[PDB]
Write a protein that binds this ligand. Structure first.
Ligand SMILES: Nc1ncnc2c1ncn2[C@@H]1O[C@H](COP(=O)(O)OP(=O)(O)O)[C@@H](O)[C@H]1O
Ligand SMILES: [Mg+2]
Lengths: 7, 72, 372, 7, 7
């Protein structure tokens, strides 16, 4: 993802 | 350092650094300002305590007498 | 009271001493040698095996085995000889009488702690024992309760995020490059200049070259072009026989494999990107405190310039306004031992020991229950 | 080790 | 060789 998770 | 007659830069170094040696080899560490202030205060306390024991020892030199003390 | 012994079984060195000492009393290579030649002179006084500095001194005559590799104990009869030598000859102490704080790298097999306990209680009959994660001790050694410890030994590298005294065990990275794989790479590259070092005794010349002359480049490609263009980096060393050997761009090239493990054909990322990938597994509230307090530990971090290269190359990864700080005390080689020495002397710790009574009741499995 | 590596 | 072995 963009902030929380890595994707 | 004037009063005590020691090299200014040696005291200046050792107040701010501490030293460790393993059996073979030796390291010199900087220390934080808090640990430097704690070390200086502990040195002052150690000087004072040893001076006190020394004055007490010379008083004992004057108070002791040569005859063997049987009891007190 | 009786002090605890504090003993750290690196892959490369044993450090041992008494709790509350500021530095270890015995450091010697954890190496066992056996003679490999015909015994011609009668009455010399043969010996089946040398240990430590004895095996260093004789090493022209000996095959040298390391009994730990990658933090795993790979044959026990040697490791038991090494501990026997540690207690009786180097410390000169009866192991009957002192607790022993042992040490281990995280995430390694569980049969290694079981055996390492069984041998302390059955063979050495120690009163009480403990086993502690290496990277946890470097925080006691560096006065911190929060940090991400990068620790690199002879055999293993690991990151352990610790925040406010809680470990974050899902974020623990273990990486299997270390000083010994740097040494084997150094031998392979040195062969380019014609120097060939082949035998186990001769490997341990290369280890000393690596310690004395290697350093980490602050830009690998710029110094590659420099040393390809100038003699200024070329430096020279004497072998034991007096041959001089001369070493150039190659001396920075070997510790670069820590940052580019592909040189060894290791698929994984370097120590910098495993550090950053460790911080990215922690909760976002604590990353700011793990970006400060990067603590270097263990001998493989002793290279000149490794702290600067780490700070530079994490700062390329982290967001532009996080204060990246690398903390690299000059005693970091001993910092794991120093932290074990602190831990074993706390009074709150004296309940934590595995006492022989408990090992008798539970058997060696107790080491997983009563320990991290 | 016991699988993935020599030790 | 140059250092190790003789050639
Ligand atoms: N000054 C140094 N520079 C680079 N490497 C070193 C230095 N001193 C020791 N090493 C290497 O690090 C390893 C020893 O580190 P150490 O922390 O003692 O390992 P362990 O803790 O597993 O015994 C060896 O590979 C040794 O060659
Ligand atoms: Mg280590």
């Amino acid at each position: 993802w963009x902030a929380x998770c890595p994707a | 350092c004037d009063l005590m007659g020691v090299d200014y830069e040696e005291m200046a170094h050792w107040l701010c650094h501490r030293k460790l040696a393993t059996a073979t080899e030796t390291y010199i560490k900087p220390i934080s300002k808090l640990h430097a202030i704690n070390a200086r205060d502990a040195l002052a306390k150690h000087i004072y305590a040893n001076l006190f024991n020394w004055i007490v020892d010379h008083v004992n030199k004057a108070l002791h007498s040569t005859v063997k003390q049987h009891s007190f | 009271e009786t002090t605890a012994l504090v003993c750290d079984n690196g892959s490369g060195l044993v450090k041992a001493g008494f709790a509350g000492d500021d530095a270890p009393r015995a450091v010697f290579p954890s190496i066992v040698g056996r003679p490999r030649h015909q015994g011609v002179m009668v009455g010399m006084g043969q010996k089946d095996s040398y240990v430590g500095d004895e095996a260093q001194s004789k090493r022209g005559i000996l095959t040298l085995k390391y009994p730990i590799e990658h933090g795993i104990i790979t044959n026990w009869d040697d490791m038991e000889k090494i501990w026997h030598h540690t207690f009786y000859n180097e410390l000169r102490v009866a192991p009957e009488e002192h607790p022993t704080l042992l040490t281990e790298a995280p995430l390694n097999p569980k049969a290694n702690r079981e055996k390492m306990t069984q041998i302390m209680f059955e063979t050495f009959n120690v009163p009480a024992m403990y086993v502690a994660i290496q990277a946890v001790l470097s925080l006691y050694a560096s006065g911190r309760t929060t940090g991400i410890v990068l620790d690199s030994g002879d055999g293993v590298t690991h990151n352990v995020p610790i925040y406010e005294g809680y470990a974050l065990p899902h974020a623990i990275m273990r990486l299997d490059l270390a000083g010994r794989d740097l040494t084997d790479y150094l031998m392979k590259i040195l062969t380019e200049r014609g120097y060939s070092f082949v035998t186990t005794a001769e490997r341990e010349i290369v280890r000393d070259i690596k310690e004395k002359l290697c350093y980490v480049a602050l830009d690998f490609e710029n110094e590659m072009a420099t040393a390809a263009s100038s003699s200024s980096l070329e430096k020279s060393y004497e072998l034991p026989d007096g041959q001089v050997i001369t070493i150039g761009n190659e001396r920075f090239r070997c510790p670069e494999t820590l940052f580019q493990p592909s040189f060894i054909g290791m698929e994984s990322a370097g120590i910098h990107e495993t550090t950053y990938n460790s911080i990215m597994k922690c909760d976002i509230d604590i990353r700011k405190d793990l970006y400060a307090n990067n603590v270097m530990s263990g001998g493989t971090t002793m290279y000149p310039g490794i702290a600067d290269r780490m700070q530079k190359e994490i700062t390329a990864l982290a967001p532009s306004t996080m204060k990246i700080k690398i903390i690299a005390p000059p005693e970091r080689k001993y910092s794991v031992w120093i932290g074990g020495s602190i831990l074993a002397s706390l009074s709150t710790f004296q309940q934590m020991w595995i006492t022989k009574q408990e090992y008798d009741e539970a058997g060696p499995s107790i080491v997983h229950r009563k320990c991290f």
